[PDB]
Amino acid sequence: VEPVVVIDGKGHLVGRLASVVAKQLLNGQKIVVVRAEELNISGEFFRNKLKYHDFLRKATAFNKTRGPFHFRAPSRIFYKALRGMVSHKTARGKAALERLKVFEGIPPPYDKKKRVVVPQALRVLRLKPGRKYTTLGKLSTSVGWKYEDVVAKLEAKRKVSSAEYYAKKRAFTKKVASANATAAESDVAKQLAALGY
Amino acid sequence: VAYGYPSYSTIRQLVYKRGFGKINKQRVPLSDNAIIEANLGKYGILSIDDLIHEIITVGPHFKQANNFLWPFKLSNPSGGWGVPRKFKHFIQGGSFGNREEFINKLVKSMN
Amino acid sequence: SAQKAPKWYPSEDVAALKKTRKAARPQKLRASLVPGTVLILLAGRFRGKRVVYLKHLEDNTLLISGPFKVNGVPLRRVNARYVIATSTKVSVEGVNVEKFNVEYFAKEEIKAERVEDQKVVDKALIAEIKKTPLLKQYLSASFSLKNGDKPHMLKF
Amino acid sequence: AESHRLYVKGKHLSYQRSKRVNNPNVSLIKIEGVATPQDAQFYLGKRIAYVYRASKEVRGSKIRVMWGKVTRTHGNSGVVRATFRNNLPAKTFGASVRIFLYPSNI
Amino acid sequence: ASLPHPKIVKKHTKKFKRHHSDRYHRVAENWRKQKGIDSVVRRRFRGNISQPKIGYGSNKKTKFLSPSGHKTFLVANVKDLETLTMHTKTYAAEIAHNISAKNRVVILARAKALGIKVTNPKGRLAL
Amino acid sequence: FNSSIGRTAQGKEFGVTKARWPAKSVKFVQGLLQNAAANAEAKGLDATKLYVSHIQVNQAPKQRRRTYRAHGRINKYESSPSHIELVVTEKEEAVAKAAEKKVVRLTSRQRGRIAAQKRIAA
RNA sequence: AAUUGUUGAAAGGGAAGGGCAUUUGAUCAGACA
RNA sequence: AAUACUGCCAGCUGGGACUGAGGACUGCGACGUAAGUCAAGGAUGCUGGCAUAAUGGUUAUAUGCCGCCCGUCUUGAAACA
RNA sequence: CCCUGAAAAUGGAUGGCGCUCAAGCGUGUUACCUAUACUCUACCGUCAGGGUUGAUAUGAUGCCCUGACGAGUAGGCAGGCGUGGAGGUCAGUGACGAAGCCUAGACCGUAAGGUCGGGUCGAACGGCCUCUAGUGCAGAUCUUGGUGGUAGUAGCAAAUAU
RNA sequence: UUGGCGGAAAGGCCUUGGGUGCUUGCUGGCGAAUUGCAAUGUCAUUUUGCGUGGGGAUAAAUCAUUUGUAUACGACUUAGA
Ligand SMILES: [Mg+2]
Ligand SMILES: [Mg+2]
Ligand SMILES: [Mg+2]
Ligand SMILES: [Mg+2]
Ligand SMILES: [Mg+2]
Ligand SMILES: [Mg+2]
Ligand SMILES: [Mg+2]
Ligand SMILES: [Mg+2]
Ligand SMILES: [Mg+2]
Ligand SMILES: [Mg+2]
Ligand SMILES: [Mg+2]
Ligand SMILES: [Mg+2]
Ligand SMILES: [Mg+2]
Ligand SMILES: [Mg+2]
Ligand SMILES: [Mg+2]
Ligand SMILES: [Mg+2]
Ligand SMILES: [Mg+2]
Ligand SMILES: [Mg+2]
Ligand SMILES: [Mg+2]
Ligand SMILES: [Mg+2]
Ligand SMILES: [Mg+2]
Ligand SMILES: [Mg+2]
Ligand SMILES: [Mg+2]
Ligand SMILES: [Mg+2]
Ligand SMILES: [Mg+2]
Ligand SMILES: [Mg+2]
Ligand SMILES: [Mg+2]
Ligand SMILES: [Mg+2]
Ligand SMILES: [Mg+2]
Ligand SMILES: [Mg+2]
Ligand SMILES: [Mg+2]
Ligand SMILES: [Mg+2]
Ligand SMILES: [Mg+2]
Ligand SMILES: [Mg+2]
Ligand SMILES: [Mg+2]
Ligand SMILES: [Mg+2]
Ligand SMILES: [Mg+2]
Ligand SMILES: [Mg+2]
Ligand SMILES: [Mg+2]
Ligand SMILES: [Mg+2]
Ligand SMILES: [Mg+2]
Ligand SMILES: [Mg+2]
Ligand SMILES: [Mg+2]
Ligand SMILES: [Mg+2]
Ligand SMILES: [Mg+2]
Ligand SMILES: [Mg+2]
Ligand SMILES: [Mg+2]
Ligand SMILES: [Mg+2]
Ligand SMILES: [Mg+2]
Ligand SMILES: [Mg+2]
Ligand SMILES: [Mg+2]
Ligand SMILES: [Mg+2]
Ligand SMILES: [Mg+2]
Ligand SMILES: [Mg+2]
Ligand SMILES: [Mg+2]
Ligand SMILES: [Mg+2]
Ligand SMILES: [Mg+2]
Ligand SMILES: [Mg+2]
Ligand SMILES: [Mg+2]
Ligand SMILES: [Mg+2]
Ligand SMILES: [Mg+2]
Ligand SMILES: [Mg+2]
Ligand SMILES: [Mg+2]
Ligand SMILES: [Mg+2]
Ligand SMILES: [Mg+2]
Ligand SMILES: [Mg+2]
Ligand SMILES: [Mg+2]
Ligand SMILES: [Mg+2]
Ligand SMILES: [Mg+2]
Ligand SMILES: [Mg+2]
Ligand SMILES: [Mg+2]
Ligand SMILES: [Mg+2]
Ligand SMILES: [Mg+2]
Ligand SMILES: [Mg+2]
Ligand SMILES: [Mg+2]
Ligand SMILES: [Mg+2]
Ligand SMILES: [Mg+2]
Ligand SMILES: [Mg+2]
Ligand SMILES: [Mg+2]
Ligand SMILES: [Mg+2]
Ligand SMILES: [Mg+2]
Ligand SMILES: [Mg+2]
Ligand SMILES: [Mg+2]
Ligand SMILES: [Mg+2]
Ligand SMILES: [Mg+2]
Ligand SMILES: [Mg+2]
Ligand SMILES: [Mg+2]
Ligand SMILES: [Mg+2]
Ligand SMILES: [Mg+2]
Ligand SMILES: [Mg+2]
Ligand SMILES: [Mg+2]
Ligand SMILES: [Mg+2]
Ligand SMILES: [Mg+2]
Ligand SMILES: [Mg+2]
Ligand SMILES: [Mg+2]
Ligand SMILES: [Mg+2]
Ligand SMILES: [Mg+2]
Ligand SMILES: [Mg+2]
Ligand SMILES: [Mg+2]
Ligand SMILES: [Mg+2]
Ligand SMILES: [Mg+2]
Ligand SMILES: [Mg+2]
Ligand SMILES: [Mg+2]
Ligand SMILES: [Mg+2]
Ligand SMILES: [Mg+2]
Ligand SMILES: [Mg+2]
Ligand SMILES: [Mg+2]
Ligand SMILES: [Mg+2]
């Protein structure tokens, strides 16, 4: 439907975002996910910290290099959830994964692009209220992810340059909204009114 | 098995559509009324409906009339079975046993 | 010999076909196809062209016209199944169209008869097109699907 | 003007398959904006084309088309099964495909 | 010019090659049936090669017809060639592989003048 | 035929670590090289352009000799003689063009667009 | 024949080879009239 | 009174898919005042494209899914037989 | 239902990812996906039941109609394929090229196999009805011969020395 | 072309001024056929290659030799107009 779909990761439940992102991929849809550090996980922080440590202890005994690899960054945590839902050793699986990019914060290009949201993985719509959950950047930091402060710093700055963007924009739609008002009551206008516009 | 009470409508549409005759074995399609009279005219019964009448009413010659009919070969129910698992009794939410006049909806989908 | 030779040869006498039972009965048209309806040509040379429906020809085709002065389509044959009949409609009750048969379009540049026949039909049409505003422009636009158009949804 | 499309956009999903055996004789087509079975019974019978490019020119073009037809609906979400003059090449899984408007009935 | 025949349908055009003919040189492709007790092929496990069987048998009506529509007949000399004199829409003559250069020009020419088809007409031709 | 051979910087020239200095092979090849030079001298071939165009080695019949192994045993101790052939050739530039002409064949709908593209425009 | 050199073509992210299917490349029969 | 529900109609009717075996006639019927006609013991009519590597066969490669070494003895073998 | 009771050795398995008003547990209603099964059709074979010697063309173990059926080790039987030699025959093929060998070239058969093209080749050889056996190989730590990977590797260092 | 912003991967965003094309805002003149009743009917963007001429630029690494802060061999670290 669109060449690329930028997903604001914030507020989505990991495996559910991973699951729709996975299918989209395999159906030809390019996808980049942003703000992976504001991702959510059901269950409280401690459970998912433990869970991560369970994962953390598995490795090839005779050579901890060949064994499993434990990536700390919230994007890569997410990628792991996601690659688990793709036949990633097939060619078609590698095909589909190249159509995917995960990101902490919202870096260039995609910060000027509009990002969308996935209702069926939105935590605020999914989780029963009163349930406990986990933020991915908090989880990632407790297991050796370095860059939580640098990301929040760059994001706070980016949000500042964006609040201006919006502000200028809302100011201009006030003109357009005012323009369209005087054009209302005219002949074009009541005709379009008729045709549903 | 699943069985029940056939209605005239489903006996009619069974004989008409998938009704065949054992004639020197040779499972013969019923297609013409003269096929029947040749083999069942002995006992009355000289039309395809003369058959259905003998069947549905259980006449004096239901043995020879009913045996003249080859077993009916039905397909699987066209909308499915309705139950999740088949090999329980109808009463217990499966398909087998005597489901009485509910046999007609079953059979009509299998025809 | 190198090969023996068969005991039986199949006779080369060629049989004749059984007497088939297939009458060519006439083709009834879908109710949306009435003369003077605006079609959308879905495929072929003039694809996406909006065009006026005139006569149902004996070979099952449909007689259309641009009109040629509106959008460049001539009096032409078109297959009823490669067409969307719209709901918009001019009155064709002053168009000859009788002249036009299958043999008319035998293959056998443009015959002067056709160039004229085009003008006589067209003039009648235009005179009626002009009766509803913007219709003449519509008939010179091409139809295309825009983003979001859902054919199984759109009233035509 | 800018648009010219006379088809509905499509996507070649999978072959028809079980868990562990596919059937290359039936492709499964995802039609843009068709989301239920009832919506997709409109497209039954429409012709599909998978257009693709090639290096060897042929009949004076470097562009080739495999033609098919929607034949039946699939599942509950407006997926649709379709068959082609030659099965689609399984690399096409996730490629774009063109569902036309003919044989029309409007 | 062959007699009319129903669309020739072949049923399994892929050569039935012997199991493991692809594996050891010693094992020729010529079909051989597996007699082993565990052999996946004999047991018909899903994924392995298929085996000859009578279901594959060609339609009686079109069996032995090569493309054109003519059952082929091996021809060694004119008298052999002439046996197809009343049968040109049913049989094509194939010249035997050992017929000499000159002798094939006689058969070809006689075949031409009789309306009999020939399947390998460029053999030993003096081009 | 290079496994467990040593490494040398001299392989770098060729992207290689394992290279060697087989003097009896060299001395035999340049022997036959020399002969092909002469043969082209007498042919009148412009020696200034000669390049080695085909040079192949495969194996002459082996030569049995035997050595003596522990507990009273015998083992083959063979030679691996070779068959060498090479041909030099006067290098030469270009090749010119010239080929088919590509039979273009297009349906009636496919010549109409062509004719109209020129009827319409250039 | 195993096996080897050269030349040509092609594939190769912890073997190779096989089945059904199709794209692409190469190659070829027959049939039109 | 209506509606639902369940059942019936030898009531009407649209969209889609696969198939077209057979090769004179012969049968059982149907429509017709009639002559004739027919959807009644298996596809015909009309139009177009190419006449070619277009379709098809072979082959090599890629891709989806699938595929453990054969032989043997054995209750049981891919077996660390 | 959940928690405690609940301790093992390479890292690790509700099949995996992951899931928390579930993608968990109980239970109900629908729709949906797909077996070599089921229904209909085409073809192949097997078995069965019919019909047909009437000349003046070509199979009577034939030809025509019809129905049903088709898993298989050990094992039985059947009908076929291929080799060496023998009787008969085709007044068969051949130095204007027999036999053989090569060939991701063509065709026939379900298959054993059969046929052809080309290339190499150089003196013989085949079809059909019969007869006959020292008549078909992947195996037997099979027999004899030939050849690989190993591998330019182990190694070529005792006896003082050039 | 004026001024300004953007380093998270900025490599893009904003603003000034003239030049020029288009304008379906509205009203006109001309054209379209025969591509024959459909046959994607070809309008994307990848990399490379060959000559033409409008700017711009004129190295190094390796073998060999050598050091010994290094070394089984490669490799490492030095030196040499
Ligand atoms: Mg895919
Ligand atoms: Mg894609
Ligand atoms: Mg590992
Ligand atoms: Mg994974
Ligand atoms: Mg993919
Ligand atoms: Mg909620
Ligand atoms: Mg339903
Ligand atoms: Mg269904
Ligand atoms: Mg069911
Ligand atoms: Mg169940
Ligand atoms: Mg049914
Ligand atoms: Mg008739
Ligand atoms: Mg009608
Ligand atoms: Mg109607
Ligand atoms: Mg116009
Ligand atoms: Mg797939
Ligand atoms: Mg499926
Ligand atoms: Mg196909
Ligand atoms: Mg794929
Ligand atoms: Mg075959
Ligand atoms: Mg065997
Ligand atoms: Mg096995
Ligand atoms: Mg066993
Ligand atoms: Mg001769
Ligand atoms: Mg020859
Ligand atoms: Mg080696
Ligand atoms: Mg070494
Ligand atoms: Mg080594
Ligand atoms: Mg060593
Ligand atoms: Mg090397
Ligand atoms: Mg020794
Ligand atoms: Mg000794
Ligand atoms: Mg050796
Ligand atoms: Mg044009
Ligand atoms: Mg033009
Ligand atoms: Mg590896
Ligand atoms: Mg293949
Ligand atoms: Mg002809
Ligand atoms: Mg009701
Ligand atoms: Mg009814
Ligand atoms: Mg027919
Ligand atoms: Mg037929
Ligand atoms: Mg009457
Ligand atoms: Mg009729
Ligand atoms: Mg061709
Ligand atoms: Mg041509
Ligand atoms: Mg082809
Ligand atoms: Mg040809
Ligand atoms: Mg062509
Ligand atoms: Mg074609
Ligand atoms: Mg190749
Ligand atoms: Mg292959
Ligand atoms: Mg597998
Ligand atoms: Mg084996
Ligand atoms: Mg035991
Ligand atoms: Mg046993
Ligand atoms: Mg066991
Ligand atoms: Mg075994
Ligand atoms: Mg074991
Ligand atoms: Mg509970
Ligand atoms: Mg372990
Ligand atoms: Mg558990
Ligand atoms: Mg779950
Ligand atoms: Mg599960
Ligand atoms: Mg539940
Ligand atoms: Mg329902
Ligand atoms: Mg099954
Ligand atoms: Mg089956
Ligand atoms: Mg059946
Ligand atoms: Mg008999
Ligand atoms: Mg059996
Ligand atoms: Mg046999
Ligand atoms: Mg024999
Ligand atoms: Mg013999
Ligand atoms: Mg020989
Ligand atoms: Mg060769
Ligand atoms: Mg070959
Ligand atoms: Mg041939
Ligand atoms: Mg072959
Ligand atoms: Mg043949
Ligand atoms: Mg040959
Ligand atoms: Mg030859
Ligand atoms: Mg020879
Ligand atoms: Mg001699
Ligand atoms: Mg003989
Ligand atoms: Mg014998
Ligand atoms: Mg013996
Ligand atoms: Mg064997
Ligand atoms: Mg054998
Ligand atoms: Mg032998
Ligand atoms: Mg052997
Ligand atoms: Mg062996
Ligand atoms: Mg054996
Ligand atoms: Mg051996
Ligand atoms: Mg060796
Ligand atoms: Mg040496
Ligand atoms: Mg050594
Ligand atoms: Mg020693
Ligand atoms: Mg010494
Ligand atoms: Mg001394
Ligand atoms: Mg930066
Ligand atoms: Mg980026
Ligand atoms: Mg930058
Ligand atoms: Mg301007
Ligand atoms: Mg415009
Ligand atoms: Mg174009
Ligand atoms: Mg230059
Ligand atoms: Mg100097």
DSSP letters for E48-85: S-----GGG---TTTTT--TTSPEEEEE-SHHHHHTTT
What DSSP assignment string belongs to D17-34? E-SS-EEEEEEEEEETT-
Closest CA to B94 of B83, B109, B103, B110: B83
Terminal Cα-to-Cα distance of chain A (whole angstroms):
24
Mutate to test the interface with A, among D13, D22, D27, D77 (most CBs of A within 10 A): D13
CA distance A84 to F79: 59
Q: Which residues of C22-47 are buried (b: 16+ CB within 10 A; e: fewer)?
A: eeeeeeeeeebbebbbbbbbbbeebe
Q: Which of C2, C13, C10 is closest to E71 using CA atoms?
A: C10
Query: In terms of C-beta density within 10 A (0-12 exposed, 13-18 middle, 19 or more buried), how is residue C63 classed?
Result: buried
Cα separation, A106 vs A159, in Å, equals: 10
Total Cβ atoms within 10 A of residue B72: 14
Residues of B from 17 to 36 whose C-beta is within 7 A of strand H: which are they? Answer: 32-34
Q: In this structure, are residues E74 and E98 in contact, taking their beta carbons and an 8 Å threshold?
A: no
Q: How far apart are CA F86 and CA F53, in angstroms?
A: 7
Rama region for A63: left / alpha / beta (φ>0; ψ in -120 to 50; rest): beta
Return the closest-CA partner of residue B78 out of B44, B100, B49, B110: B110
**Surface of A (67-96) touching D: CB under 8 A:** 92, 95-96
Rounded to the nearest 5°, which phi and psi values hold at D103?
Answer: -65, 105
CA–centroid distance for B78 within its chain: 17
Round to whole Å and give the CA distance between C65 and D50. Answer: 32
What is the whole-number distance in angstroms between the Cα of residue F99 and the centre of ligand 46? 18
For residues F52, F53, F58, F61, the Cα torsion angle rounded to the nearest 10 degrees is -70
CB A15 within 8 A of CB A116: no
Helices (H), A27-144: 45-57, 74-83, 91-98, 123-126, 136-141
| DSSP code per residue over C98-111 | TT--SGGG------
For C92, residues 6+ apart whose C-beta sits below 8 A from its C-beta are: C35, C36, C52, C54, C124, C125, C128
Q: Is B24 helix (H, G, I), strand (E, B) or coil?
A: coil
Nearest CA among B44, B60, B59, B80 for reference residue B11: B59
Torsion over CA: D59, D60, D65, D67 (sign): negative
Q: How far apart are CA A109 and CA A101, in angstroms?
A: 13
Asked, as a colleague might, if the bond just before D103 is cis with ω within 30 of 0, I would say yes
Give the chain D residue whose CA is nearest to the CA of F109. Answer: D59
Cβ–Cβ under 8 Å, residues C75 and C65: yes
Residues 6+ apart with CB under 8 A from B72: B14, B18, B19
Q: Give chain E's count of helices (H) and strands (E).
A: 3, 3
Give which of C74, C77, C90 is closest to C37, Cα–Cα: C90
Would you say A35 and A116 are in contact if contact means Cβ atoms under 8 Å apart? no
Residue type present at position E104: R
User: How many angstroms separate the CA atoms of C39 and C80, rounded?
Assistant: 10
| C-beta of residue C56 within 8 angstroms of C-beta of residue D14 | no
Asked if the bond preceding C67 is cis, omega within 30° of 0, the reply is yes
Task: Tell me if A79 sits within 8 A of A102, measured CB to CB.
Answer: yes
Contact E77, E51 (CB under 8 A): no
Residue with tokens 């670590």: F17
> Beta strand C37-41 with C50-56: parallel, antiparallel or unpaired?
antiparallel
* Angle at CA of residue C98, ends C94 and C104, nearest 5°: 135
**Residue A23 parent element (H or E):** helix A14-26
Gap between the Cα atoms of F64 and F68, Å rounded: 13
**In terms of Cα–Cα distance, which of C86, C77, C74 is closest to C33?**
C86
Residue count of chain F: 122
CA B80, B83, B88, B90 dihedral sign is negative
Mutant choice from F103, F106, F108, F117 vs D, greatest count of D C-beta within 10 A = F106
Amino acid code (one letter) for F63 = Q
CA of B109 to C1' of H6 (A): 17
Q: At E109, phi and psi to the nearest 5?
A: -60, -45
Handedness of CA F21, F27, F29, F30 (dihedral sign): positive
Q: Which residue of F has its CA nearest to D56?
A: F102
Please state, in angstroms and as integers, the Cα–Cα distance from residue A159 to each residue in A106, A107, A111, following that order: 10, 12, 10
CA F106 to chain centre: 44
- Paired strand residues for D72: D81
Structure tokens at E46: 């899903």
Structure tokens at C39: 């079609």
Instruction: Characterize the bridge pairing of strands B28-29 and B20-21.
Output: antiparallel
Reduced to 3 states, what is the DSSP secondary structure of residue D78? Answer: coil
Backbone angles phi, psi at C31, to 5 degrees: -60, -25
Residue A73's nearest CA partner among A5, A136, A29 is: A136
Residue C62 dihedral angles phi and psi, to the nearest 5°: -125, 135
| Amino acid sitting at position F34 | Q
Confirm or reject contact between D11 and chain A (CB < 8 A): yes
Within the 91-120 window of chain F, which residues sit less than 8 Å (CB to CB) from chain D? 104-107, 110
| DSSP string covering B25-92 | SS-EE--SHHHHHHHHTBTB--SHHHHHHHHHHT-TTHHHHHHHB----PPSPTT--SSS-SSSBGGG
Of F54, F99, F67, F63, whose CA–CA distance to F81 is shortest?
A: F63
CA of D16 vs chain C CAs: smallest distance (Å): 24
In chain C, where does DSSP find H-type helix? 68-71, 112-129, 135-138
Q: Residue A36 and residue A9: Cα distance in Å, rounded?
A: 5
Q: D24 beta carbon < 7 A from strand H?
A: yes
Give the up-direction half-sphere exposure of residue F79: CA atoms within 13 A in the CB hemisphere.
8
Is the CB of residue D83 less than 8 Å from the CB of residue D50?
Answer: no
* Cα–Cα distances in angstroms (integers) from residue E88 to residues B34, D38, E99, E106, in the given order: 47, 59, 21, 18
Distance, in Å, from the CA atom of B16 to the CA atom of B10, rounded to the nearest integer, reads: 10
Distance CA A36, CA A139 (A): 12
CA distance E103 to E125: 11
Q: Phi/psi zone of residue F33: left (φ > 0), alpha (ψ -120 to 50 degrees), beta?
A: alpha
Q: A73 near A140, Cβ under 8 Å?
A: yes
CA C34/CA E126 separation, integer angstroms: 70
Task: Specify the long-range contacts of residues C107-111, CB closer than 8 Å, at least 24 apart.
Answer: none
Method used to obtain the model:
X-ray
Angle at D58 between CA D57 and CA D60, to 5 degrees: 80
Q: B13 — alpha (psi -120 to 50), left (phi > 0) or beta?
A: alpha
Asked if E35 CB < 7 A from strand H, the reply is: yes
Spatial distance from the CA of E76 to the C1' of I93 (Å): 8
